[PDB]
Amino acid sequence: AVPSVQTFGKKKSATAVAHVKAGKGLIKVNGSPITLVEPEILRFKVYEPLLLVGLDKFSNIDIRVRVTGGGHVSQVYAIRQAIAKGLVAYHQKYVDEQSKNELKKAFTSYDRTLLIADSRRPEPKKFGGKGARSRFQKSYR
């Protein structure tokens, strides 16, 4: 085969899976390039990882990311985490440790939960209101 790792990135329920092999420097999401991914107001959220670590570094690898679940924002954050985690996985396996640690160090020194999967999750609603804490309404008499 070739050198290749696969990773992921989650936000709420949105899971974003990421194939990262060695290639000519593509970066695709679902089936379309990173120059799309609209929202687009949040374009630089997923642009971010390739700018934090210098725009090169990808010119010997190939990335595709498929996203399922979550909403729109959920998926955007999911895939940026997926890509970051991906790159660092690739260097953990194939390059060296000082570089993997240098990329981790360059990420975490800024971050937005890029390698660390945010554990914020929806809370159960209980009987008595239209919410998790929010109770309905009383009038006494």
């Binding site: 089936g31 379309s32 799309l36 609209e38």
Partner: protein
Amino acid sequence: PGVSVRDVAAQDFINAYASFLQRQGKLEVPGYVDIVKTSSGNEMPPQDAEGWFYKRAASVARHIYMRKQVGVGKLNKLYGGAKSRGVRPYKHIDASGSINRKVLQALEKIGIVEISPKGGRRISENGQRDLDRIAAQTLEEDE
């Protein structure tokens, strides 16, 4: 370099393709256009008046191209929107099916789609051809 349509930004591709089927003339546009409302969950008829059938056709072409096979109902559920039940809460309700279906047949005659097995419409190889072509075009607009 080569191209699919996954290389063009939806509204770019679809605007383009719209102006293309427009610039062409071979369409089959039933006739009830401008008098039809596209959806029960809608108020007025389309503001485009002259056009939009091209827009919907292009949208359909594009979308069916992405995936395997898709019938008329999927396009109802897709183009279905928020109905304002006046003083009652919004619910989602499907769009028109004669519009969608007649677009399918009108893009089946003009050769961009085909009644595949499993049911539903499948993107045509000539459709692959032309869609990728105008993709190359629309991209080449911003050379």
